[PDB]
A paper describes a structure:
To investigate the structural basis of FN3K kinase activity, we determined a crystal structure of HsFN3K in its apo state. HsFN3K∆ crystallized in space group P212121 with two molecules in the asymmetric unit (ASU). The dimeric arrangement of the two HsFN3K protomers is supported by an intermolecular di-sulfide linkage between the side chain of a Cys24 residue from the ATP-binding P-loop of each protomer. The electrostatic surface of the Apo-HsFN3K structure exhibits an overall negatively charged pocket, decorated with polar residues, near the P-loop for ATP binding, and a sulfate ion is observed in one protomer occupying the space for the nucleotide β-phosphate in this structure. Adjacent to it, the substrate binding pocket is also negatively charged and is decorated with polar residues. Notably, in contrast to a fully extended conformation of the P-loop in AtFN3K, the P-loop in HsFN3K packs against the N-lobe β-sheet.
Glycation, a non-enzymatic post-translational modification occurring on proteins, can be actively reversed via site-specific phosphorylation of the fructose-lysine moiety by FN3K kinase, to impact the cellular function of the target protein. Further characterization indicated that FN3K is responsible for protein deglycation by phosphorylating protein-associated fructosamines. Here, we determined a series of crystal structures of HsFN3K in the apo-state, and in complex with different nucleotide analogs together with a sugar substrate mimic to reveal the features important for its kinase activity and substrate recognition.
Numbering used by the authors:
A (entry chain A), B (entry chain B): 0 to 290
C-alpha cells in the first residue's frame, strides 16, 4: 500500500488526500475556468487537425445520442491562424475509475448492445466519417463483414505504415502468413455491429460523484470484443468492470484468441506512434497467433 | 494568442488556466494532509524514477540556494515495492500565473544573472549531477563552449534516441546539415553560464498571495535564452512577464534564430516522449533553420 508507505516514511497517522488536478499534461491539452464552467482545450497546429477534431466531435455525439454513457459535451472547433485548430469541450471534475467501475461495465455492455437492440439499426461495420486513432486518420468505409473490415482498415493499414516507415521484413512475412488464418477465429459466430468508444484505455475513463465518465473516443461500429482489448492489455480497470460487463455480454467461444488479434492492432498502432519499443510485442503477438 | 481567442470564441469575461502541480504526462501527483501539514507527492513506477526525482531534488535545491524565486522544498525520495519511487515535497496553494507575471519576469532574469552578479563562480555549462528531461536522463558533463554543450548533450542526445526508436531518415539528414549551421547562430557572442529552471512551461509556474512560484525544474547552467523557448512555444505567460524579463536581459543579436534552435529541442523531446505527432514540427523547425 503506497499510502501506508507514505505514512511510515513521513511518520504520520493521517494522510488525507485533497485538492484539485493542477495544470495537467502538456501533450493532451489544458483546462480553463470560464464564466459558464470549466472547459478543456486541445490544440493541434497540423493541417489535418480540423478533420481529427471533427471525428472526435462525431464520436462524442454518437455516444451522447445513446444516453447510456457520460462523455464531455463538445463545444467548439476553432480554426487557428498559422494552421491547425483547437477543440473546446466541457471539462468534468474527475478522479480515477474505482468505485464506479462495475457501473461503467454495465454501461459499456449496454452501449455495445444499443445498435442491435434499438430502432435504427446500423448493419455494417465502419462509421459515417473519419476518426483518428491517436494521430493517425482511419478509413471507416462501411463493410458487411467484420473480419474484412478489421483486416483491411485496421491491421493492414497499420502494417502498411510500418512497411513504409520501417521496411520491417519480419512484420511483412508474419502478416502474409497470419492474414489467411484470421477467418478461423470468427467461424460459427454471429457478429453484430456494436457502437464502440474505440479507445477505452484506462487513461480515457474516470469518475465523479455522479458516475463514471469516458472521453477521447475514436468511435466506429465494430465487434464488441475489440473494445476490451486495450482495456485489458494496459491494465487499470478494476476486476468488477469486466465482471459487470460480461454478466451482460458473456465471453463468446474463441474470446481469448480474438483478444490476441485485437491486442495486435493496439501494439501495431503503438509501434507506429512510439517506435521500435513496440516491435517485439507486435511480432510476438503475430507469432502467438500462428502457433 | 490562444487565451484571447478562447475568450472571444466562448464569449467569456473570465478565462483562468488550471494551475499548479499534479498528475502530468509522466508522473502521478497528489496532495495529502498529514499530522505535520500538507505535502505533495509525485509517483513514478518506471525503473529510472529515483534518478529522475533525485535530479529534481538537486534542481530545487540549487534554485532555493539563490533566494531569488520561491520553489517547494524537497523532502524525501522513497523507493516503491514493485519498482519506481515516490517524491514528497512541500505543498503550496497555487493558482495559474496572472497578476504576478511581471514579478516572475524580474525574478527569472535575476536568477539567470545571479551567476554573473552574485558570489557564484560557475564558468562552464552543465551541472554537478544528472537531471532528467521528463523520462530521459541527460548528460550534464561540463563544457566550456555552450553551442558544443547544447549540440552534444541536448540536440544530439534527442536525435540519437529518435534514430534508435524511429530510424527516421529525414531527421538524420537534416540534423547533419544543421550541425554545421549551429555556430553561426551565435553571432560571435560570449555566452555566460546562467542557472536555469530548465522546464519553464506555463504549467510549471503559478502564484499565491505572496507572489509567483515555480516548480518541476530540470536545472543546469545554460544560455539564459534557452529558458524562454518552452515558455514562448506553449504560451500561457502574460506579455508583462517577457517585458519585465527583457528589461533586465535584452535580446542579444540572433535571438530570434536561436529561439528556433531552442524550440527544436522541445519538439524533439516531445517526439521522443509523445510520438509521431511531433515529427512534423521537429523536421519543419530544422528546415526553417536551414533556409
Amino acid at each position: 500500500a503506497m499510502e501506508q508507505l507514505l505514512r511510515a516514511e513521513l511518520r504520520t497517522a493521517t494522510l488525507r488526500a485533497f485538492g484539485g488536478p493542477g495544470a495537467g499534461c502538456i501533450s493532451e491539452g489544458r483546462a480553463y475556468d470560464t464564466d459558464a464552467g470549466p472547459v478543456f482545450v486541445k490544440v493541434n497546429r497540423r493541417t489535418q487537425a480540423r478533420q481529427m477534431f471533427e471525428g472526435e466531435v462525431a464520436s462524442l455525439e454518437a455516444l451522447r445520442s445513446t444516453g447510456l454513457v457520460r462523455v464531455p459535451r463538445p463545444m467548439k472547433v476553432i480554426d487557428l491562424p498559422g494552421g491547425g485548430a483547437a477543440f473546446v469541450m466541457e471539462h468534468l471534475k474527475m478522479k480515477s475509475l474505482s468505485s464506479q467501475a462495475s457501473k461503467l461495465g454495465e454501461q459499456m455492455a449496454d452501449l455495445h448492445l444499443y445498435n442491435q437492440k434499438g430502432s435504427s439499426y446500423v448493419d455494417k461495420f465502419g462509421f459515417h466519417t473519419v476518426t483518428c486513432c491517436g494521430f493517425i486518420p482511419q478509413v471507416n468505409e462501411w463493410q458487411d463483414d467484420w473480419p474484412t473490415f478489421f483486416a483491411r482498415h485496421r491491421l493492414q493499414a497499420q502494417l502498411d505504415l510500418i512497411e513504409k516507415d520501417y521496411a520491417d521484413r519480419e512484420a511483412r512475412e508474419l502478416w502474409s502468413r497470419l492474414q489467411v488464418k484470421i477467418p478461423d477465429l470468427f467461424c460459427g459466430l454471429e457478429i453484430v455491429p456494436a457502437l464502440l468508444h474505440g479507445d477505452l484505455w484506462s487513461g480515457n475513463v474516470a469518475e465523479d460523484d455522479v458516475g463514471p465518465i469516458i472521453y477521447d473516443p475514436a468511435s466506429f461500429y465494430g465487434h464488441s470484443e475489440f473494445e476490451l482489448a486495450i482495456a485489458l492489455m494496459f491494465g487499470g480497470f478494476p476486476r468488477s468492470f469486466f465482471t459487470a460487463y460480461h454478466r451482460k455480454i458473456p465471453k463468446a467461444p474463441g474470446f481469448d484468441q480474438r483478444l490476441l488479434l485485437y491486442q495486435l492492432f493496439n501494439y501495431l498502432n503503438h509501434w507506429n506512434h512510439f517506435g521500435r519499443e513496440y516491435r517485439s510485442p507486435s511480432l510476438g503477438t503475430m507469432r502467438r497467433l500462428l502457433k
